[PDB]
Symmetry: C2
Subunit: 153 residues, 2 copies
């Protein structure tokens, strides 16, 4: 399967990333986690995304997500994600081929009444995949929650 021309600008994502991150939020005291993310494709104008996080010290599973990245040649992109916690997300924004970055704001957060906005920003930095996830809640404004850096395998 060749990479679809719609997906070609993001082909640096494709493969298996592994690394580690940190969470902290006003409500949640800080923590570290292992993370693995696989981007794959089947020759269509879509990238499939799957992800898992585990306890850094125990290797005991925490969360999983899966979804689909849908980029379009005008630089816009939508991402739909389902989480093992029972949450769904519609994410929208842009990608920049120069910066090899992707900036997303939730258009919808579903099945999580307390969580308002979620943004996710990816960025290839030094050949490693980085992201910041931000969360806003009923009571707390939008602010970082998760930061990670992963090596491509």
């Amino acid at each position: 399967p060749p990479v679809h021309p719609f997906v070609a600008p993001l082909s640096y994502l494709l493969g298996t990333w592994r690394g580690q991150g940190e969470g902290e939020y006003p409500t949640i005291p800080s923590f570290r986690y292992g993370e693995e993310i696989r981007f794959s494709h089947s020759g269509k104008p879509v990238i499939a995304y799957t992800q898992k996080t585990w306890k850094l010290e125990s290797g005991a599973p925490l969360l999983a997500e899966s979804g689909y990245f849908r980029p379009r040649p005008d630089g816009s992109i939508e991402v739909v994600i389902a989480c093992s916690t029972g949450l769904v997300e519609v994410q929208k924004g842009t990608y920049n081929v120069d910066e090899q970055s992707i900036k997303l704001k939730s258009d919808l957060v579903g099945n999580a009444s307390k969580w308002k906005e979620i943004s996710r920003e990816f960025e290839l930095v030094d050949g490693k995949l980085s992201y910041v996830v931000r969360l806003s809640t009923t009571t707390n404004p939008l602010q970082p929650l998760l930061k990670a850096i992963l090596d491509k395998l």
Copy 2:
């Protein structure tokens, strides 16, 4: 690892299913598709679901979806799904251990303005997994869209 007691009632699902199905809807002329579904778990109170469909005759990929089945011992169950078409779904309902059936109605259909409600009912019949997906849209009431029957591999 080993089956969480919450997932235990649904352990028949676990594995890879392969079969075919049919789509028809007032707007859409009838079509057939090949379909593969994989239910798996990592010992948590959740079943991961991934699915793909392809053209019966050509073998060309059509859609894919992924998400999570979350059953609870009160017989209730919640399913979240992300689709390669950029849709998300929150499904809610019940499973019946006697009938080996699962009946879900969407609590939310996300990023698909014309589609209002999607119901999904599964049933193990004769060792085969079979389902009906129902759709209502802005102008059409709820009615079958997809019917499939899969063999466990």
